[PDB]
Amino acid sequence: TNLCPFGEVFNATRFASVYAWNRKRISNCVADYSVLYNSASFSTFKCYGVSPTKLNDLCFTNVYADSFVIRGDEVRQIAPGQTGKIADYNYKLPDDFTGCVIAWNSNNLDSKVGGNYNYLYRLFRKSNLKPFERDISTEIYQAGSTPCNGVEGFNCYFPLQSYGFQPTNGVGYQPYRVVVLSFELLHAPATVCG
């Protein structure tokens, strides 16, 4: 028995913002998801295709783990089928998703009383996002008829706005650290069993 690093993705001093989440491919485990299930600090533990009380009696191939920071009122858009300004331009889950979306309140760290402008989120895009696709294209949208040449102005519209985080916003505008496991069973031997 050797447990496998759920402690590197759940215990981190800095999650990346939602326009560039960090994917951590976890493989060759004997994992324990019931430690996650019986922690009593997660405000949203919703599994979407596996029975969560019986997570140890299954073997997958690769257990991916995305992680980002969004507002509390926008963790409804980290469900399969729901859309919005996060689920289509920042992080899009498929409709045949088989995983568990985990989140908790994180107002201790990600909020500073003058503002914490380090977390960004994408504002618009030319189209929507296919499932599990990130877009680090931080450049001027350039509407109109003139090239902006890298400034912001009348027809430029820089597409990354900052989360203005404070300890006084409301419970729904406080930062919720989301981590979404994505189980996968492709045609291969199975390693992550439990």
């Epitope: 509407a143 109109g144 008829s145 003139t146 102005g153 009348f154 027809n155 519209y157």
Partner: antibody
Amino acid sequence: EVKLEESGGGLVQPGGSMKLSCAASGFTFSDAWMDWVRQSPEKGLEWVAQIRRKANNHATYYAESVKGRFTISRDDSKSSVYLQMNSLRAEDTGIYYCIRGMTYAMDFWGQGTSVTVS
Amino acid sequence: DIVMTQFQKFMSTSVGDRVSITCKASQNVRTAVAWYQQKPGQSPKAMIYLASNRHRGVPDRFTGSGCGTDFTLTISNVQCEDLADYFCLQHRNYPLTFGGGTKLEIK
């Protein structure tokens, strides 16, 4: 919240000049592409002038009918936009709004002060 | 310049129907069209920026889209507070031309 006032309400004889003033409050003035839009009941809504923000070195743009007769200039110390117009004509009757930022968010028009000619 | 026409100078309806005001472009403007609503006796309040997005405080009813030449603003469940003048501006290049306008009436 955001409000925008205007000034320069009066009538001229044909051939004179006036200066309009737009005092703003409630927002960061140094980054707002502030415009000036006229409206007349015989032609409809038109467009007069534009001054950009400080990061684009306060660029200015005018319409076709006012190139040479109008001059827009801003000063971030007073949070004001000025429309200096000279040598007015007989067709220059209409209300003159003041706009925070046009065709994006934070778009709040003013109220307008009517300037006509004799 | 680039002129925007507006075929309907009067669109009359009753309360609860759907009206679709249109605004054609002269040449190809990409998506850079805005919409405005002017109640009589006021200053216009913006509703649509960049031809598909909506402002802050504008209801779900005022939706609009269009690209290329044709741009349509369709309003649904017309209340009695939507008697107004509806303009369309293009901001592709710096001669910025407003539309004609469309005045509504509830019968």
